Design a protein around this ligand. Structure first.
Ligand SMILES: *[C@H](C)[C@H]1/C(=C/c2[nH]c(/C=C3N=C(/C=C4\NC(=O)C(CC)=C4C)C(C)=C\3CCC(=O)O)c(CCC(=O)O)c2C)NC(=O)[C@@H]1C
Ligand SMILES: *[C@H](C)[C@H]1/C(=C/c2[nH]c(/C=C3N=C(/C=C4\NC(=O)C(CC)=C4C)C(C)=C\3CCC(=O)O)c(CCC(=O)O)c2C)NC(=O)[C@@H]1C
Lengths: 484, 495
């Protein structure tokens, strides 16, 4: 039933389209009858000034309004509705991709005492707590905790993205009684690349009533465009029923989502859920926007420093291996006497050393027969620098059999036939999520699981370079030995 | 300057490899002195032949950047005429022109050095940094720990301001070396080329400042009939202009680490040595990675502090909106909390012309000059808000009170009423005082200080006269908020 071509409006706010240069309402959201007590037929054709009874809005007239909008962007228009209640609205003007003038009106009130300053004071105090954390875990756990405190959502969670753009719920705070989603991985597909790239322009997604019935504009077709309006710019853009389904059968009544953007690419989300509907005012969205920026700034700081700590540990292995490789009469015998360090050098779980005729297996590797066949294959490939794959099963079909040990392989040709190999198993650390058994998280997880079949963790650049460093070091040692 | 005569620092060799045969099309002229074999001898030979090092199996076409990047670095060694057995670090890039280049820095041993020491100190540096309260303390630690890790006679931290003029924000040096801390240099002292180059080439090493630069022979690459672009080289010699600067500064070796945010150069870690001091591939790569994470924490600290301004400005906004409506006169509310009023736009003075009356707060010009100024503002017919970093530039009379109101932010009120904030010229926020008091340097104005820090400071000084600190976005919006509030207090004071 529900069409995918739904650029409609979440029903709590109004969208109006202003004709130029006359500044009359060319189209309006259909909920205007309820919200303004006046029908679309009544309002169609009226200038904004005449609708808002205070004539609050003073749009200085122009043939075209350009960047004058930026001035009007924080506007608090109000008009009397019922018993002279004088309902107020936060107003925000955009130019749609079609090039029309659009104004969005979210009803506002200052009933929430300490509405914005409070949030701001808690936010700085969050940032002090955050910066004083040692562990990155503790660090993440604090983000969600303090966001949830600040915001008051029934659930707040931190989503990061895999190197395949998949998902990983890396932190979470929720009611004791709610189901935990921590560790749940989900497919990249669950948030399509449009919605992602759209977070760059629209950094916050608010759905304060999930069950709210989306309303169109009337007339639906802009007169000038003879084409529908593009709500890409709107906060009130209604979300696609696909996702609402997901939320509904997850038990969600209101969402908030803060994008975490690095250098223009989406790093992760702060995804907030409420079981009850729950509105978030302009004021507090603006503050959330700014908070998420700085929160992410500290995220990327922590993430960066930790990933430099990997480079130290890999240097550590590199050094211990360079030492003991030259100590023991056979260099190979040095490597195999410190296998912890050898596997550690590329963050692998197994390895093989074919030097001349001999061949040594270390850690978790395939049976020697299957390995030998593999080496054979690699010399046929005639790899010049290095071979590495996150999914070996795809390129060497026979490796489907030992997917569980070597789905991932990195191999470096020491010589024409002498090679060094590192093996990774398919992702088995997914135990983090229950795996509990029709489009709901448990399904998404099962789908993600299907995708990661035959597939190891990705070979990080630092790991590869640290293996190349060992290869070149070995070659040089052998040359010196001959020269010796 | 423009001509960019592409020469080489003389300690290392640059070769240009023809493809697909990997023969040397061009070589640096120092090859005679360093390899004991002449350019005539070496030109045409494959690299493998010269350095007894595995010549890459002759590529199907050209060396893919995978093959090029896996090669980096490679240790090449050769015996040459006279028993000479010499080790080089080799490092391959392809030019913007596409041609392949290899640079050979003489090295001490054959086997790799993982810089474990450096890495252990770096790890420990980052723990120190994360535990720092003040941003100053924070910066001061960077330089200190870099200097420890690296062992330079001097390390300093340069941050660029909103026009890219330099500011030496931190520094660690030998006790009896001259301090450059607080020095501000004009953006010109690092030309926009060198800057835009740091985003692609993050590290600059000049281990011999006095070394005589050598060219390639032939100078003209046969494949381009064009001289060769060394932009991508480590061994690219720096322009004599800058070497002069270093020489007259007493430098024997320089290292520089770019600090890049969002693809724009934020600042430098500029390292100086009195003696020559080389930095190997290995240790550059470690430095490169260190500077990234160091900067990552810098931008984290910088960001959080600048959002602390947003909270404090919200705080002023709220207290001012409260007390403005409490006291019967809104003006009387503003003047009872002047700390908060100046604080709202991070200014040092303010003026309130409502109707007839006019109230000066903090540091402002004399009433006569202010009154003339208000007059001027009505003539401007300011629509939303007026703000300028240098008022003296557009209102000439303001040259007189430059030292109080070089910067002005004004919000007009109808009936000729106005709110003003004043900022002083930025000459007292920073007082490096490189010239001894009123040094009579002008006497004997032969530009003797040509290419000298002091000169740069005097140049920068000339640029920043008549000029306040820039009006930050947050500050303007906080003032607009007060404008809207005042308009809505005039409306509610209907009487
Ligand atoms: C439809 C066939 C597919 C689809 C489309 C779709 N998804 C989104 C947006 C989001 N989806 C998620 C996913 C999750 N949120 C959670 O809390 C969890 C459990 C931990 C998951 C898996 C998220 C975070 C978003 C964006 C954030 C938000 O709540 O706004 C959209 C865009 C909707 C819009 O217009 O903003 C679309 C179109 N989702 C599916 O599940 C199908 C595979
Ligand atoms: C020549 C007419 C002008 C000029 C050109 C120029 N400068 C650079 C590079 C740098 N200049 C500096 C400046 C300083 N370094 C310091 O230590 C200090 C004192 C605190 C100053 C003022 C710096 C940091 C650099 C870049 C870092 C480095 O050492 O590499 C270049 C580029 C040289 C190259 O090819 O890499 C050029 C062409 N410099 C002048 O002083 C003239 C105004």
């Amino acid at each position: 039933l529900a069409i995918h071509t739904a650029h409609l409006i979440q029903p709590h706010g109004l969208v109006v389209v202003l004709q130029e240069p006359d500044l009359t309402i060319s189209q309006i959201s259909a909920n205007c009858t309820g919200i303004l007590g006046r029908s679309p037929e009544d309002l169609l054709g009226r200038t904004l000034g005449e609708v808002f009874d205070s004539f609050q809005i003073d749009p200085i007239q122009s043939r075209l309004t350009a960047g004058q909008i930026s001035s009007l962007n924080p506007s608090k228009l109000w008009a009397r509705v019922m018993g002279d209640d004088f309902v107020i609205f936060d107003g925000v003007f955009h130019r749609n991709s079609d090039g029309l003038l659009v104004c969005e009106l979210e009803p506002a009130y200052t009933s929430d005492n300490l509405p914005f300053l409070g949030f701001y004071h808690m936010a700085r105090a969050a940032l002090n707590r955050l910066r004083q954390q040692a562990n990155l875990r503790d660090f993440y756990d604090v983000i969600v905790e303090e966001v949830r405190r600040m915001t008051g959502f029934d659930r707040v969670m931190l989503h990061r993205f895999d190197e395949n753009n998949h998902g990983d719920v890396i932190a979470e705070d929720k009611r004791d009684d709610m189901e935990p989603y921590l560790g749940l991985h989900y497919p990249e597909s669950d948030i399509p690349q449009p919605a992602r790239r759209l977070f760059i322009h629209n950094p916050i997604r608010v759905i304060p009533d999930v069950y709210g019935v989306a309303v169109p504009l009337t007339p639906a077709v802009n007169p000038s465009t003879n084409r529908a309006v593009d709500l890409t710019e709107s906060i009130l853009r209604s979300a696609y029923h696909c996702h609402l389904t997901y939320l509904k059968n997850m038990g969600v009544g209101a969402s908030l989502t803060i994008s975490l953007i690095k250098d223009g690419h989406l790093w992760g989300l702060i995804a907030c859920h409420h079981q009850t509907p729950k509105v978030i005012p302009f004021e507090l969205r603006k503050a959330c926007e700014f908070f998420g920026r700085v929160v992410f700034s500290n995220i990327s700081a922590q993430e960066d420093t930790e990933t430099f700590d990997y480079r130290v540990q890999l240097a550590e292995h590199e050094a211990v291996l360079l030492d003991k490789m030259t100590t023991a009469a056979d260099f190979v015998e040095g490597l195999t006497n410190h296998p912890d360090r050898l596997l550690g050098l590329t963050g692998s779980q197994g390895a093989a050393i074919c030097f001349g005729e001999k061949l040594i297996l270390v850690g978790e590797t395939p049976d020697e027969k299957a390995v030998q066949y593999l080496l054979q294959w690699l010399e046929n490939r005639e790899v010049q620098d290095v071979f590495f794959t996150s999914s070996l099963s795809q390129i060497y079909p026979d490796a489907v059999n030992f997917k569980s040990v070597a789905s991932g392989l990195l191999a470096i040709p020491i010589a024409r036939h002498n090679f060094l190999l590192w093996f990774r198993p398919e992702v088995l650390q997914t135990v983090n999520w229950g795996g509990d058994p029709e489009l709901h998280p448990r399904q998404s997880f099962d789908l993600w699981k299907e995708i990661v079949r035959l597939q190891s963790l990705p070979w990080q650049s630092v790991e590869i370079q640290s293996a190349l460093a060992l290869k070149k070091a070995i070659v040089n040692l052998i040359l010196r030995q001959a020269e010796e």
